[PDB]
Symmetry: C2
Subunit: 314 residues, 2 copies
């Protein structure tokens, strides 16, 4: 799994750029910032642009990491107690801006109106409010699920990993693959604002049976969420093929650490991911990641977006 | 319809950039050129990048034009007699690179495997032996208006048409949808899966399981004849996919027929002539505008109208099932 390690010069250039941009723009509430994102991303070090472009076009590996960013721990300040009711943007705005630049190299940032107050950049940190370990494609059910996810580690003092797993095709029979490509599986979900919520629930959600594998039969994409996937009892071929796919993905799961200054890129068509339980201290020093969802085609989701301009679905 | 007119300063900067890149890279055969496109595009004048970005994000107007480029006629040379057998890249490589840069600002350039040797930038100019064809290489024949590849799930999202020369100012036709001109009842019908849109012949699968799989989805469409909508996206400002020649409104569906005819009349009456004169680059949103071409008499002497064309996809990976490799940008 390729990775790119920033030189100190690159790290400084990225840090300086993100500080400049944070001073120049108000928040993501600035439509001008969202307009400017791809042009601003072209001010990133050229090696970093080239690396991510190669990852996107290769369409081979399920994830990659850019390591060695300078995330100023004093400026970022203590890990918050909650995201809810927290003023936005905080002193960590430069790091959020970094992820938005990265999202513009891969596609377009977007979000979910019902998640974390509709902020485009989500927070991942412990909130004081037996654990099965699980993994999944993000929003496997949804036709407009993320194409990529970007996870930036602001801090990770105990080196808590993320789980990531890809599909090793060689472990699967040709027959099971063909079945997995057929529409034989059910994948379940997780004011005119009130009218839209009900429209989204109806409109698509009550979709038909669908495939788990798609794209090239030689190197398939996947949408695999075991918890929400079910197979009609009578369809024994589809149950068998599903069991086989689960076992291959489950057995291939890896733990990938995103340490302070790492940005982890996950291809949501080629990899599943999960989180791992960990003991927090709840004292403002805990692990803190930021998360941006990326779509390759913002227009495809128009029917679920309140306006042409909004990047929020729902 | 918004447009952008280059100052001479901007036109000079664009021309020098395209000549610089033409010298620096070999051909579009260079995978490194295709990798670098969006980063290279950020070297275009800021005003141009901002204008196209606003166009793309506004998702409102169905076409736009950037006017006043400097396309050096002495360097470009005579309009070829055929696209086959030309030295590649040609002396117009800087203008091909320009359209490729513009394509990278909108999405990804892509092509069709069986079309013009799989070139990502196509030629449009008259070819004598094609005089009696309704193709891009035609002239005498009326190309009536349509959405490009209306039936195809992986049809172009945008088209880019660059006019290297157009001495007799022959127009392109472009038409959008004025929604206020349709009844709410007709719009609802148009959004429902009530219409059959047939594939163009060039897409028909009519040797290997790997090959068969590349056409299985289109074959299924031919076999199952699914009905579908003509309008989609937001009901207040919809996308459309309208190719009248390939659309069948089922005989029994009176409401569908009524709503189709109303849609056809609105689009047909709103058609406008857009001239893409020498130095103009026309951008068409293939979800919001239909386009066609007007007949004209060619001279076949190296002085004819010559356009370049690039198809743009917002999501290259969506079409993977119809692409031979992960790397290829060619469908089929």
């Amino acid at each position: 799994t390729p990775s790119y390690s920033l030189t100190p010069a690159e790290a400084s250039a990225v840090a300086e750029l993100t500080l400049e941009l944070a001073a120049a723009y108000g928040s993501f509430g600035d439509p001008v910032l969202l307009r400017d994102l791809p042009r601003l991303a072209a001010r990133l070090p050229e090696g970093v642009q080239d690396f991510l472009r190669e990852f996107k076009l290769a369409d081979r590996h399920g994830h990659t990491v850019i390591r060695g960013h300078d995330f100023d721990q004093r400026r970022i300040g203590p890990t918050p107690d909650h995201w809810r009711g927290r003023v936005r943007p905080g002193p960590e705005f430069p790091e959020e801006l970094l992820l938005m630049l990265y999202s513009a190299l891969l596609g377009e940032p977007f979000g979910w109106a019902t998640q974390q107050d509709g902020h485009l950049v989500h927070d991942i940190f412990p909130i004081r409010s037996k654990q099965l370990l699980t993994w999944h494609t993000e929003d496997a059910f949804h036709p407009y699920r993320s194409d990529y996810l970007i996870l930036g580690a602001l801090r990770n003092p105990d080196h808590v990993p993320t789980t990531v797993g890809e599909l090793d095709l060689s472990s699967l029979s040709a027959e099971d693959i063909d079945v997995l490509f057929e529409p034989r599986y059910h994948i379940a979900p997780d004011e005119e604002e009130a009218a839209r919520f009900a429209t989204i629930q109806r409109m698509i959600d009550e979709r038909p049976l669908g495939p788990l594998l798609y794209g090239s039969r030689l190197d398939p994409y996947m949408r695999l969420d075991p918890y929400f996937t079910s197979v009609p009892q009578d369809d024994t071929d589809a149950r068998r093929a599903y069991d086989a796919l689960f076992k291959v993905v489950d057995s291939g799961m890896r733990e990938v650490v995103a340490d302070q200054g790492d940005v982890l890129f996950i291809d949501n068509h080629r990899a599943v991911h999960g989180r791992l339980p960990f003991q927090a201290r709840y004292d403002g020093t805990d692990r803190w990641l930021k998360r941006v969802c990326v779509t390759s085609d913002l227009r495809r989701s128009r029917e679920m977006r309140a306006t042409s301009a909004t990047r929020l679905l729902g």
